[PDB]
C-alpha cells in the first residue's frame, strides 16, 4: 500500500498547522489510522488514533498532545487529518501517517516548531580544482528542514552520497557528492537538483570545470 502525507514545515511556537494524509493500495475505511512522530530526543512516539464509522469515530491521544491535537479522518477522500493547535517546540519532529498498529507507514513529513523565518538554500558547485571523478554540491543557509538532493534529476544514484544537514548559526548546511567515470565528465553533464519545499524553491546546479 501507499500513504502520502502533506503539510508541515516551519511553524512559530504557539501557531497552528494541519497535516493531511492521502491513502491508497487498501480500503481506507476499514483500518485504524494513527499519527506517529520521531525525533532524536523522543524516539518513536505514538501521537493519535482514529477508528471506523462502526466505532463511533473513536479517538485516542497521547498524554502530551491531548487537548492540543485533533485527529480526523475522511473516508470519502481517503484522507486523515491532524489539526495541531498551540504547537510548542517539543512537537518538532518527523510525523508518520500510519494505518493499523502499525501495519502501514507513509513517508513522513517534517514539522519544525521554531520562530525563525523560512530561508531558501544557496547551492554551490563543487568541482575538482584517477579513473573516477567525484563532484559535489554544497547547500548552505536554508531553513527549515528538509531539502532533497538528486543528481541529473535522479538519473545518477549509484555513486551518490548525501549527508545529513547540520544546524549552525549559518542555518542548515548539507552536502552531496557524486562519483562518475572521469572520461564522462564534463562531456556528459552532471547536475545536482536541490529541492526545498518549505520555501517553494528548487535549484539545479550544473557542475562545470573550474
Amino acid at each position: 500500500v501507499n500513504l502520502e502525507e502533506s503539510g508541515g514545515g516551519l511553524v512559530q511556537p504557539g501557531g497552528s498547522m494541519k497535516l493531511s494524509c492521502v491513502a491508497s493500495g487498501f480500503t481506507f475505511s476499514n483500518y485504524w489510522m494513527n499519527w506517529v512522530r520521531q525525533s532524536p530526543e523522543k524516539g518513536l512516539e505514538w501521537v493519535a488514533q482514529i477508528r471506523l464509522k462502526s466505532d463511533n469515530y473513536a479517538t485516542h491521544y497521547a498524554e502530551s498532545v491531548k487537548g492540543r491535537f485533533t485527529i480526523s479522518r475522511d473516508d470519502s477522500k481517503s484522507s486523515v487529518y491532524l489539526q495541531m493547535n498551540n504547537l510548542r517546540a517539543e512537537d518538532t519532529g518527523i510525523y508518520y501517517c500510519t494505518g493499523g498498529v502499525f501495519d502501514y507507514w507513509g513517508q513522513g513529513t517534517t514539522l519544525t516548531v521554531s520562530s525563525s523565518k523560512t530561508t531558501p538554500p544557496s547551492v554551490y558547485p563543487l568541482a575538482p580544482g584517477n579513473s573516477m571523478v567525484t563532484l559535489g554540491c554544497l547547500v548552505k543557509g536554508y531553513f527549515p528542514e528538509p531539502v532533497t538532493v538528486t543528481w541529473n534529476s535522479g538519473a545518477l544514484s549509484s555513486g551518490v552520497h548525501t549527508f545529513p544537514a547540520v544546524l549552525q548559526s549559518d542555518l542548515y548546511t548539507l552536502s552531496s557528492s557524486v562519483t562518475v567515470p572521469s572520461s564522462t565528465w564534463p562531456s556528459q553533464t552532471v547536475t545536482c537538483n536541490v529541492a526545498h519545499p518549505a520555501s517553494s524553491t528548487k535549484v539545479d546546479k550544473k557542475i562545470v570545470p573550474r
Binding site: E45, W46, K140, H161, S175, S177
Partner: protein
Amino acid sequence: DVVMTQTPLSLPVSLGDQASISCRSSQSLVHSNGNTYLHWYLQKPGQSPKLLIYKVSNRFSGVPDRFSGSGSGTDFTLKISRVEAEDLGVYFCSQSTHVPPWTFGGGTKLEIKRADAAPTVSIFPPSSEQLTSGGASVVCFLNNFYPKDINVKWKIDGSERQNGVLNSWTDQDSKDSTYSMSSTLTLTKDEYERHNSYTCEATHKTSTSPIVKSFNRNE
C-alpha cells in the same frame, strides 16, 4: 505506559551469520486472548519504519523467511538467519496490548561488519558563487570507508584549524556496507584569501599514514 527496552543499542554482525535482538517490556503484554500484541519493525536509513513481524512470530507481507520472532511474556527475540546487506538499519519493537498508549522501543541499530575499507578523499576549494557572497567553504569528502571510526584534521598553511569545521556522516550504505563522511571548513572570504595551502587529513584504521588531499589558492 508500558516501557519497551531494546538491547543492545547497537549490534555488529558479519554477512551470512545470524543476529538476535532483545526487546523487553515493563509488564507481560499477553492479552487475555492469544499471545502478545508484539510487533517488530525495520527502519532502513532514510526511510520510514516497516512492519516486519506481528504477534510475536507472524511474518508480514513480503518478509523473507530469514526474519523470525521468538519470546513470550516480557522477553521477545528477533532473529535474522544469514544476515544480508539490505538488512542493516534500526530495528524497533512496539506493543498494542496495554493501550493507550502504544509504545515503541529505543531501537537497535544493525551494523554490517564488513572488511576494512580506506576512505577515498576528495578536497574542493570554494566556488565563485560563495566567494561573491563573502563566504569561503572548503569541502572534503571521505567516501566508502569502514569501520566508521575516523578522524579528520584541517590544516591551513601547515597550521591546524578546529573552529569553522562542520562534519557529517552518512549511515551505512547497504550496497557496499561502507560509511561516508563530509568535512567542511567554512571561513570568511577575507581570511581565506590570506592563506594559500588548505589540507584535510584522514586518520583511519586502514593506514598508519594519514590520507592527505591538498590544494593551493594558486590553482
